Design a protein around this ligand. Structure first.
Ligand code: HEM
Ligand code: HEM
Ligand SMILES: [Cl-]
Ligand SMILES: [Cl-]
Ligand SMILES: [Cl-]
Ligand SMILES: [Cl-]
Ligand SMILES: [Cl-]
Ligand SMILES: [Cl-]
Ligand SMILES: [Cl-]
Ligand SMILES: [Cl-]
Ligand SMILES: [Cl-]
Ligand SMILES: [Cl-]
Ligand SMILES: [Cl-]
Ligand SMILES: [Cl-]
Ligand SMILES: [Cl-]
Ligand SMILES: [Cl-]
Ligand SMILES: [Cl-]
Ligand SMILES: [Cl-]
Lengths: 707, 714
């Protein structure tokens, strides 16, 4: 049958598999392959030309509605990007993961297996020059353009994944199309981007399957907010999207559709939902009179007529006009000698019955140009929000205008410091009254916000000094101000002492200071190490920063600083591993980082938690040696939720204090094996260098400008 | 809280994670680190000295029975190697995986967490010079040696793993210490080495917990047989092992022992089974739930076990741990053993149902009788069996390192003869390939034969491979999958070439059939690539030798016979699992990643090397021409697939429009267009710019498989 996994035997076993994913890139792509360079070779217009032809090239295994695949591709592209959550930046269209389980078999992605299959020929034709990820979004753009609407822009650069992202927790439910995440609409469990397991954002029929538009609006507003969209963007996206195509529900899905892709027979070759006798959502009908043309049909139909809920031919909730003025005003999608009546979903009526969405819809209807621009910009934002800063956007269709949601960075209008200035500045920093701990902590506070999921955060920009980061509890505002003030004076003095047009950013000084401190700690232990350093980081201002959007990067747990927000729901070590994944760390790198860090001591509020050493600020393997010493016995700290005491097994002496973050490295079976290596007699030099390599890696995660 | 795995949503989803494990090595060890070289720097004698010293250096957190940890360490080493299965060669001590879940938390490994912990100081002291895997076995040897019994030998070389082997299926049970693998004793589901989930071999109390000695012997015999041991070896091992130590069951473990390691509190730091009364209490120690020593002198090698077992009558009873155990019917042995911890107390010997089984079983009894009559014979058999037990998963002699490796090579090591001649050079290699290609052998024949030779290798216990050319010997020469008659013809032609090459040499150069089989396969592949317009040169290294029947334990190779073969699209009409699942299972033994397996099969189908020369999966109108036709045609939506009528494994590729039968295939071929991840790989190779990449990736995988057993070149 199949081996039983350890997680099956022990549900609470640390989920290290998410870090293992950072230890290797599955798939056949060569390590030295550069997608950006390959995409640069692509003739984008040629791909777009082929996509446009495909729009009206119906394939017999999935006949195009109205003879135009446009709407289907738009839904496909929207769903690809629609799984994004601002909480951890996971989900999204960047890896084209809609192609892998579980996403490929989610109920909401029914028949998109066919949409993706239609693009196979074009994918094969251009090969590595265009990823599935880039292609699916481009397909959506061409669909929109071919139907009479100009897009705001397009960027390539999304590298294809070859498996699912194991780190994404899609929710607590054990069944698709069920919800155990909200009791009241608009009160969805934190950290989730949808209101139902297996859906993109919300239930099209209404919350809990009840056709209550006002209530639906509350889940619509919250889920979209959790996907970085406000009221105008949300209304424009829904109305813009539903200006095209139709919903499919000729009959009930539960009884007429075969198994989803992952559960379908091998002969179906990746396809699923085989019709036993089109049925997709189970809801049936077009929103507008001309489903393949951009116009004001959706907004006018919604606002100018009265709608009432009913059960459609698929047994699902949908709305019909009270009058018969729109009766059979739409041509059937396939039967040339037949017609249909427009329909509205509960989620569409929501935009009309919610007072705030209604104001936006009224404004859009009165001025089509405003409706258009809002949709154009929101579609661009939707499909590029997980791609990171402007440097990563590739191709001839990238707009000249950089949007605030890209977390743009100013240009460094000055010459960068050379090897001589660098060494100079490093001594100047170590010459200041700043301690090794202050420098390391500050460099970490700056770089640690980066998350590889949507490429946001990092030391470039020195946003640590701006709102909201400068005031985050974890960053110890008052302590932080002291360090930045000192580094700022060093920057000022240096920039003034220059005459050759050279300047240094505060962003670089923070990282350089961190490097200098680590090299010092290593020196204190008898090791001579040179940490790679590359200048070029710039100082972003508040004008390059959407402050509220950065709250999403605020940590509840920080291993390096041994900070644990006394409010977390999951065990601290689980959040630690979750966070480590965003920094692209393997279990070994995480171990080396935390262990090495504890010998230096850079804890929040300067606690001694996990600092198992008699010589702080001295990079050694003391953390592991003392952690593994059986002469010490550990016990939970009295009246504490995360702290432990390390007592001498014999004399009873309280030798150390620690958190679960520290102790997991001596408890988890795999982490302990790594700890034993670093805690060995002739392994300190290795630990020092592995710590240095990981430190350097994190400091450079957001350096897309150097790629 | 944690993400739900795809396996949870779809229990039947292909387990590609076992191949992903081959795509990288977790842990902090550098890729260029060579353990063999590091182990050579080790002062083995120095380590053994510290081990012997540790034996009698009792730690208070886990007091040593009778003041000697020896017996505990023997059990530890025995259990480490005891998980081995001949079926797939998985399990065993080579990776020291007893340290990782699920094995580290099996009920049968209770308190071995304490045993391994005692070795930590020594492990840290020598660092990379000695692996946990080598150390645990060495600890067992030193324990035995320190207690009056010299060992047959010892070899280092076991590289530590940093995680469990995800490919090992330990059984159907969903609960430890429960069995759903056998109705009648001795009829255990094939493929499993134990009779109960979470146990090394069998239930110490007897089958299904019933104290039935005769029934127990049936499972003991079958489980040990599946671990490569016969009657004599089995009785020698059990009798030899139980000559030392005691069983612990001061009270019921079910209510007096804390959670196993994986479920234990973080402050336990890797340990588990916390005793309610305290692990410090030697007299309250609980492990199996069974209590008492086997002999009067638990820390001394002697005939105590065999004598107590045979010379007295034993009867069933419930011990203080609430488990079945046997006591002397008389009182001649009453309080004949000193208490393991109380200086002023005595204890009475006990026997397990499994021990009594050796006396009740007619055949086991005969062996035990002979052992009792010949103490020297008992020692001889136990010494060799202990050596075999602890080294059976290390592969051929070339891999055994250290000064304690016996000069004598054992048959179970699958020994190889030395090549008494100079190996062929660049010129000869070139001449031989042309000669082979000049013969009347086709590309398909050459490729098929080279695969039949190399594909038997399995990285689990490192048995098999093309070195030795055992393909030409029993039992492989007659394996159905190898098409005996067809094979004979190819080998005859290759042997004729070997003959003319060897006879034409004026120097001391000769070539082995083993090398010619691989050389011919390489030549055929290069030829197929050339037919496609690609000039490739496959890496080749001579040196393989031709092993004889004297170097081969024929019956033992039966375990390497495949039920499925992807390269040859062979599917035995008996398999229980879907063919693609066996395919992946087998790919893992060859250390392949999902991408390598895909390139291999896809590329292979353009060559066409199928069993019985069928056209299954051969999606190309130009066989023996290495291209990406397989992927291009498999992915073409113009083709629709369906199960073949009245067929157990065949499927038909029909023209969606005309209905014409374009191709025929098996699940081995179609899984690459069905599974979400494999399909992503197929799409890459099936693209207009990837044929060259496919060719080179195919070549790299072919070359990799051909060289898997070349330990002689390491
Ligand atoms: C409150 C959020 C929304 C809900 C609940 C929702 C839901 C639905 C449902 C149930 C269907 C029909 C699937 C089927 O039976 O074929 C559909 C289709 C469609 N959606 Fe939406 N949607 C939302 C937002 C969006 C957005 C943001 C866009 C893109 C800018 C878009 C685009 C489309 C298009 C073009 C179709 C037509 C597909 C076709 O003709 O095959 N939708 N939607
Ligand atoms: C049919 C197979 C066997 C069964 C069912 C079995 C069973 C058991 C049980 C239940 C225990 C006690 C665990 C405990 O409470 O502490 C134990 C221990 C022991 N076993 Fe066996 N065993 C088998 C074979 C073997 C072999 C093959 C060896 C090694 C050559 C070995 C050697 C030992 C030693 C040295 C001890 C004593 C550990 C100590 O003092 O702490 N056993 N066994
Ligand atoms: Cl299992
Ligand atoms: Cl792979
Ligand atoms: Cl590549
Ligand atoms: Cl994802
Ligand atoms: Cl909802
Ligand atoms: Cl619901
Ligand atoms: Cl209305
Ligand atoms: Cl940032
Ligand atoms: Cl600010
Ligand atoms: Cl702001
Ligand atoms: Cl963290
Ligand atoms: Cl790792
Ligand atoms: Cl999940
Ligand atoms: Cl190393
Ligand atoms: Cl294993
Ligand atoms: Cl196979």
């Amino acid at each position: 049958k199949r081996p039983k996994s350890n997680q099956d035997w022990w549900p609470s076993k640390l989920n290290l598999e998410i870090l293992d994913q950072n230890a290797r890139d599955v798939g056949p792509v060569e390590d030295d392959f550069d997608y950006a360079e390959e995409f640069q070779k692509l003739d984008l217009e040629a791909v777009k030309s082929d996509l446009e032809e495909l729009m009206t090239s119906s394939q017999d295994w999935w006949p195009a509605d109205y003879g135009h695949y446009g709407p289907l591709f738009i839904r496909m592209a929207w769903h690809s990007a629609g799984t994004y959550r601002t909480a951890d930046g996971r989900g999204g269209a960047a890896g084209g993961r809609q192609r892998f389980a579980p996403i490929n078999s989610w109920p909401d992605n029914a028949n998109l297996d066919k949409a993706r299959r239609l693009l196979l020929p074009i994918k094969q034709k251009y090969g590595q020059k265009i990823s599935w990820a880039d292609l699916m979004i481009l397909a959506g753009n061409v669909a929109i353009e071919s139907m009479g609407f100009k897009t705001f822009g397009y960027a390539g650069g999304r590298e294809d994944a070859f498996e699912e992202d194991k780190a994404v927790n899609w929710g607590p439910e054990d069944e698709f199309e069920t919800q155990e995440r909200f009791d009241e609409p608009g009160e969805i469990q934190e950290g989730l981007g949808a209101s139902v397991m297996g859906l993109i954002y919300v239930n099209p029929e209404g919350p809990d399957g009840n056709p209550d538009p006002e209530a639906s609006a509350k889940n619509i507003r919250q889920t979209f907010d959790r996907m970085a969209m406000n009221d105008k963007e949300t209304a424009a996206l829904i109305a813009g999207g539903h200006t095209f195509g139709k919903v499919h529900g000729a009959d009930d899905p539960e009884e007429n559709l075969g198994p989803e892709p992952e559960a379908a027979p091998i002969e179906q070759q990746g396809l699923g939902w085989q019709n036993k006798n089109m049925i997709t959502s189970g809801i049936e009908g077009p929103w507008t009179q001309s489903p393949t043309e951009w116009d004001m049909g959706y907004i006018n139909n919604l606002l100018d007529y009265e709608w009432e809920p009913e059960k459609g031919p698929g047994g699902a909730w949908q709305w019909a006009p009270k009058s018969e003025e729109l009766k059979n005003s739409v041509p059937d999608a396939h039967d040339p000698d037949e017609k249909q009546t427009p329909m509205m979903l509960t989620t569409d009526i929501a935009l009309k019955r919610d007072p705030d969405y209604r104001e936006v819809m009224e404004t859009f209807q009165e001025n089509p140009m405003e409706f258009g621009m809002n949709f154009a910009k929101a579609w661009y934002k939707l499909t590029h929000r997980d791609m990171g800063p402007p440097e990563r956007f590739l191709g001839p269709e990238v707009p000249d205008e950089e949007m605030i949601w890209q977390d743009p960075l100013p240009d460094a209008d000055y010459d960068l410091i050379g090897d001589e200035e660098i060494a100079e500045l490093k001594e100047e920093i170590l010459d200041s009254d700043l301690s090794v701990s202050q420098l390391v902590k500050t460099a970490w506070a700056s770089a640690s916000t980066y998350r590889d999921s949507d490429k946001r955060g990092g030391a470039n920009g020195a946003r640590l000094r701006l709102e909201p980061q400068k005031n985050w509890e974890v960053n110890e505002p008052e302590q932080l101000e002291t360090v930045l003030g000192t580094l700022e004076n060093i920057q000022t003095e240096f920039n003034d002492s220059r005459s050759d047009g050279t300047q240094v950013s505060l962003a670089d000084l923070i990282v350089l200071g961190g490097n200098a401190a680590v090299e010092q700690a290593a020196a204190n232990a008898g090791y001579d190490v040179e940490i790679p350093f590359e200048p070029g980081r710039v100082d972003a201002g508040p004008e390059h920063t959407d402050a509220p959007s950065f709250d999403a990067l605020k940590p509840k747990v920080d291993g390096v600083r041994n900070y644990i927000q006394d409010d977390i729901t999951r065990p601290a070590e689980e959040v630690l591993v979750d966070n480590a994944d965003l920094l692209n760390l393997t279990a070994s790198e995480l171990t080396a980082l935390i262990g090495g860090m504890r010998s230096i001591g850079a804890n929040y509020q300067d606690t001694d938690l996990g600092v198992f050493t008699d010589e702080p600020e001295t990079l050694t393997n003391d953390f592991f040696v003392n952690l593994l010493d059986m002469g010490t016995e550990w016990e939970p700290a009295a009246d504490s939720e995360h702290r432990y005491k390390g007592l001498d097994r014999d004399t009873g002496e309280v030798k150390w204090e620690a958190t679960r973050i520290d102790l997991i490295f001596g408890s988890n079976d795999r982490l302990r094996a790594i700890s034993e290596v670093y805690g060995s007699a002739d392994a300190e030099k290795k630990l020092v260098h592995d710590f240095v390599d990981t430190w350097s890696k994190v400091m450079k995660l957001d350096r897309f400008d150097l790629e």
